[PDB]
Amino acid sequence: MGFKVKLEKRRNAINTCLCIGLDPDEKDIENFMKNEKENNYNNIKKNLKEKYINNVSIKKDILLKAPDNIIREEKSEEFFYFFNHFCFYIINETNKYALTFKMNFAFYIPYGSVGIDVLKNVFDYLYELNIPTILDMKINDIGNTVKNYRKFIFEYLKSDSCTVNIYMGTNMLKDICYDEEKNKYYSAFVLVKTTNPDSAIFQKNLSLDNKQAYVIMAQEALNMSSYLNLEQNNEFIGFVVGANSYDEMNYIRTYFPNCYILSPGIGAQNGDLHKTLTNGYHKSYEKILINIGRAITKNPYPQKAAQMYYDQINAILK
Amino acid sequence: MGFKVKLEKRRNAINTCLCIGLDPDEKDIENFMKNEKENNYNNIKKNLKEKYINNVSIKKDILLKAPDNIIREEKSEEFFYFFNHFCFYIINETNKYALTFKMNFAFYIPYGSVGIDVLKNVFDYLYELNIPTILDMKINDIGNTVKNYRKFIFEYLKSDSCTVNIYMGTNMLKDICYDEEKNKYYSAFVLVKTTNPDSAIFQKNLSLDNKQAYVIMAQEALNMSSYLNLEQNNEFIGFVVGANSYDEMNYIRTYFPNCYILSPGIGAQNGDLHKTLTNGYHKSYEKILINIGRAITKNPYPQKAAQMYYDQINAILK
Ligand SMILES: COc1ccc(C(=O)CCC(=O)O)c(O)c1
Ligand SMILES: COc1ccc(C(=O)CCC(=O)O)c(O)c1
Numbered sequence: 001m002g003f004k005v006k007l008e009k010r011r012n013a014i015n016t017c018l019c020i021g022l023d024p025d026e027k028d029i030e031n032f033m034k035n036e037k038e039n040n041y042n043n044i045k046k047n048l049k050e051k052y053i054n055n056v057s058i059k060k061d062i063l064l065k066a067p068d069n070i071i072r073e074e075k076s077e078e079f080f081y082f083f084n085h086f087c088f089y090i091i092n093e094t095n096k097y098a099l100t101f102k103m104n105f106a107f108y109i110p111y112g113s114v115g116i117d118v119l120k121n122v123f124d125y126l127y128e129l130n131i132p133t134i135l136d137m138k139i140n141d142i143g144n145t146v147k148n149y150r151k152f153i154f155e156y157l158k159s160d161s162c163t164v165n166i167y168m169g170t171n172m173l174k175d176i177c178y179d180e181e182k183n184k185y186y187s188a189f190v191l192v193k194t195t196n197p198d199s200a201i202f203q204k205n206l207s208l209d210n211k212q213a214y215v216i217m218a219q220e221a222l223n224m225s226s227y228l229n230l231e232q233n234n235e236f237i238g239f240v241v242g243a244n245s246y247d248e249m250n251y252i253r254t255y256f257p258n259c260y261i262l263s264p265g266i267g268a269q270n271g272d273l274h275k276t277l278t279n280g281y282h283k284s285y286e287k288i289l290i291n292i293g294r295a296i297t298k299n300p301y302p303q304k305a306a307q308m309y310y311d312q313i314n315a316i317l318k
Numbered sequence: 319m320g321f322k323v324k325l326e327k328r329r330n331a332i333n334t335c336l337c338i339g340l341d342p343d344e345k346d347i348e349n350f351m352k353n354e355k356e357n358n359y360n361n362i363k364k365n366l367k368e369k370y371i372n373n374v375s376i377k378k379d380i381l382l383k384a385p386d387n388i389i390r391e392e393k394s395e396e397f398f399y400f401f402n403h404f405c406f407y408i409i410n411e412t413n414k415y416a417l418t419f420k421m422n423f424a425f426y427i428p429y430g431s432v433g434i435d436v437l438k439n440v441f442d443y444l445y446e447l448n449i450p451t452i453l454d455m456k457i458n459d460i461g462n463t464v465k466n467y468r469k470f471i472f473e474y475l476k477s478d479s480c481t482v483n484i485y486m487g488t489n490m491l492k493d494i495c496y497d498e499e500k501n502k503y504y505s506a507f508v509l510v511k512t513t514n515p516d517s518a519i520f521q522k523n524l525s526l527d528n529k530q531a532y533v534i535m536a537q538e539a540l541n542m543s544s545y546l547n548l549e550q551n552n553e554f555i556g557f558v559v560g561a562n563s564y565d566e567m568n569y570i571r572t573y574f575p576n577c578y579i580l581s582p583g584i585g586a587q588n589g590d591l592h593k594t595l596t597n598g599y600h601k602s603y604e605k606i607l608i609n610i611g612r613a614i615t616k617n618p619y620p621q622k623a624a625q626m627y628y629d630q631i632n633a634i635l636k
Contacts, residue, residue: 023463058430106459106466112438112474113376113431120430138458140483141424142514144586145341151428165458167485168509169516191486196460198487201538206524206531213524213531220519 002234003160003187006132007260007286011099016317017285018310019134019262020098021293022090022122023107024083028297032089033082041067047088055128056121063121080114087122091129093303094296097310100160101126102262102291105137123157133160134262134289138191140165143175150176154186161187163240163262170220173237177228185228187235187260190221192252195242195265218252222259236260243290244271253280253288261288266309267295274316285317320552321478321505324450325604328417335596335603335635336628337452337580338416339611340440341425342404346615350407351400359385365406370446376435377402397429402436406443411621412614415628418478419444420580420609423455441475451478452580456509458483461493468494472504479505481558481580484539491542495555503551505578508539510570513560513583536570540577554578561608562587564594571599571606578605584627585613591627596634603635 011017036044044067047053053064062069062077069081091101108119126133139149139162153162164176177186192214193203206213218239225237239256241249243265252261261281266273273290281288292309299305329335354362363385365371374381380395381402392399409419426437444451457467457480471480482494495504510532511521524531536557543555556578559567570577579599584591591608599606610627617623 025466104459104463106457106463106470109434110466110469110474112470113434116427116431116434138483140456140458141422142512145422145424148424148428156428156430165456165483165485167483167520168456168512169514169519171514171516194460194486196487196489198489201487202485202531202535205526206520206534207526208523213520216524217520 002185003132004231004234004236006130006160007099008284010132011284011286014096014099016097016310016313017099017289018097018306018313019100019102019289019291020090020094020296020306021102021104021136021264021291022087022297023104023293024086024090024297025107029079029083029086032086033078036067036082036085037070043089044085047085047092050088050092052125052128053088056124058117058120058124079111080117083115084118084121087118088125090297090302091122091125094306095129095131097306098131099286100132100134100289102134102136102289102293104293105135120157123159127158133157134189135159135162138163138165139176140168140172142168143172146172147175150179150186154179154184161189161238164188164190166190166217166221170224173221173224174228177225177230177235177237185230185233185235187230187237189238189240189260189262190217192218192221192239193241193245193248195244195269199242199245214248215251215255218256222256238262238287240264242269243273243277244269246272246276249277250280259287262291263289264291266290267292273312278313278316282317320503321450322552322554324448324478325417328448328450329602329604332414332417334415334417334628334631335606335608336416336624336631337418337420337607337609338408338412338614338624339420339422339582339609340405340408340615341422341611342401342408342615343425347397347401347404350404351396354400354403355387361407361411362403365403365410368406368410370443371406373446374439374442376439381439398432398435401433402439405436405440408615408620409440409443409447409449412624413447413449415624416449417604418450418452418607420452420454420582420611422611423453438475441477445476451475452507453477453480456481456483457494458486458490460486461490464490464493468497468504472497472502479507482506482508482555484508484535488538488542491539491555492546495543495548495553496546503546503548503553505548505553505556507556507558507578507580508535510536510539510557511559511563511566513562513587517560517563532566533569533573536574536577540574556580556605558582559599561591561595562589564598567595568598571601575601576605578607580607580609582609582611584608585610586616591630592634596631600635
């Protein structure tokens, strides 16, 4: 059922709000392939034995084959196989620490269709482990058009949420968060403050009445969720606020109690995790997701790294 | 070469600024297939005679497969077949009238990888035709992440340009419009004024120094075009300005002569073409692109709809 119900009952099960990012780059794949080839396909063998690997839908005939795919012909299909197995490897090594997983679309698109097949299988894999999902795609377009992203994200990947950029207009969120022909509803996180070093330039130097753009936008987003029947239908519109923007985090949390927040920036940006950004927030702590990607995924022991953050988080939660 | 120079050359060769939108939805593909499954594969037989379809890189064998279906092997590939053949038919029927084709990424993703194969084949076919290309994808993210879009768009599809949403910042363009490790420069059109009903909330009501958002945004974009050194390299950052934004079109062509503007909104939105759009913001006219999508591709006779619009735009260019 609904995502609000999926976040609470999950954080009940595992007691954190760590969100693990899975953004594999060319180097992550090329390197997992090297290690696997020089270690008799170790983690792939692990992968290939996990229970719910059968629940993926794209190219099972190649994915679930044992690795005599080196040059037992099947040359062309190598990249597919290791890209996907790498993703499986990180999910398997870390899912016991993660409330949600956030996959950023841009990492899956630059080789063409092969990465979309990987992104599809990764989303099936998470679905079946019934683990909350986010696609970080910052979608934005006109309505007839944006419904294509909705078909992509919630029907095909079957994702539980997505990031959206609302600069074109708050109205786009109507053909993102609701399908009428289906009568289904869906959740989203709108960009409020992002972690890029020049983000102030528009989300701050721009204002409507001595209010900064991010507040207006935040205010706009949350009035659109109220306008749709999402809270009621167990879905939400929430906010992306970067981990390095502390003042703004304390602003949003007080002047918007009960909102869902998704917070990127800890690790490869770091700054202070235990500033007014994780703390200041509490009950139903699924409402403040701390995204960590590369500090886990580029760590030689992703399991270790995941626990490290799961415990730091599970300490500051007091 | 470089995009400006490609733009100039075609503009002399064909005397227009018509940009044709290639956004095929599901009704388009099914309808294309039924008419052909009726009219004896008339238009597909014509695609099969075209020089460049022998150059396409994904599923040549399928795509070139005997005009009919002869109800053989593939049912797996029927949707791919008729999607790609619909796009080739539009291009074939309309290309002599187009200064540029714009493809909207959204229409090519919601079926998973199959439509990314189509889109790839469509950019390959356009590349071989040497016809100016825009991917309308409205990309945005942080720098490390956004290089993946630049890869997809400029290396993988070999597009000439794309649409970008700069709301997060201007810094992202260093990683879109510029590739240092290849020392390549690429062109883009940033969102300035968009055609969705509520497009003013942020675009017009936000401000700094009594200037509206879309004026700072357009200014700052151009400040990065100068920082990146893109003109010197025959490339640019330009502006998306909705056809129905009469006043603002006038304003930007006034305060930023020589800028490159992309204008969508004619046909499947109202109102018309002269009405200020093309004359508000006239120049040396590859700099004012008039995008027309559905009113060409959803018309029974696309070549004729193309011609008719091409006639209108030329007439208006005095
Ligand atoms: C889930 O994907 C991510 C995304 C970002 C980070 C950072 O910490 C870097 C953020 C910045 O440098 O602005 C990460 O570790 C994983
Ligand atoms: C790119 O080709 C297109 C695609 C879609 C439309 C619309 O349906 C309305 C556009 C709007 O409301 O701004 C169009 O006029 C042209």
